[PDB]
Design a protein around this ligand. Sequence first.
Ligand SMILES: [NH3+]OCc1ccc(-c2cccc(C(F)(F)P(=O)(O)O)c2)cc1
Length: 282
Amino acid sequence: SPYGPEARAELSSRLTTLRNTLAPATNDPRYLQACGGEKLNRFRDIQCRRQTAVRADLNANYIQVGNTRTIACQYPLQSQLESHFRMLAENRTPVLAVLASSSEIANQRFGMPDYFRQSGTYGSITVESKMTQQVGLGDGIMADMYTLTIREAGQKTISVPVVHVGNWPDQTAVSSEVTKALASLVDQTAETKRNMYESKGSSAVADDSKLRPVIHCRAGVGRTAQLIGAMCMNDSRNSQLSVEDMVSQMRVQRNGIMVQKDEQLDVLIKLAEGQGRPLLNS
Ligand SMILES: [NH3+]OCc1ccc(-c2cccc(C(F)(F)P(=O)(O)O)c2)cc1
């Protein structure tokens, strides 16, 4: 079988080699480096590919999987929130998908600020959060939606739709069905917001660094990578892109941990199989 244990074993062999070779060395020229005392990386071993970095002071990467353009990042540190909101505003972000659980955010030991469910002030930026609809994705998994209105004196005010999956636990894979429902919700939300900008003649529409969905979980490598993979498979432009390609693109463009659990890779495989998409490059 193209999806049998042999093919799966080969896929894993290739991806493990790639993970091991992309592991960051100290002062690795492939990875963004902290400057001046301030912590950059939420986790020492989860680093940000230099070439695709979004801002010098964020652990955040531009990611293009086939034709699908997104930003993947870590959950921003408290000290990074002003820069994070500037990135969001500048990108005219059409959807911010947060996959870190409510339990994770509430646990102050993890230092995950509650930045999208509450209003706040971060340097010169003020942020207003409003709750909108709640959508069930299946298997009890829930998406809570918000809008974040980002203001700064002398800047255009920008509002960002948020899709928060609050009950996808760390180091797990939600089912292929839940994943497909989630990808559809996130793409639909982005599409609506992107259409508003287009209807207003925004110049962001012509700029491939902009209007990217922004996706983060805690580290930005497990749950984030499962969602990005699913989104890529929902994009009609990506015919024939293999699972090897998709995962190898996420890893070279962010870090080697992208798709963190075997069960996450298994959901990508099952979605591929459903479409008759190849696992391996010939
Ligand atoms: N230190 O070894 C590598 C390493 C270190 C930390 C993590 C990690 C830490 C927190 C959460 C997660 C994660 F749950 F996989 P996410 O889905 O948020 O990316 C992963 C994953 C890999």
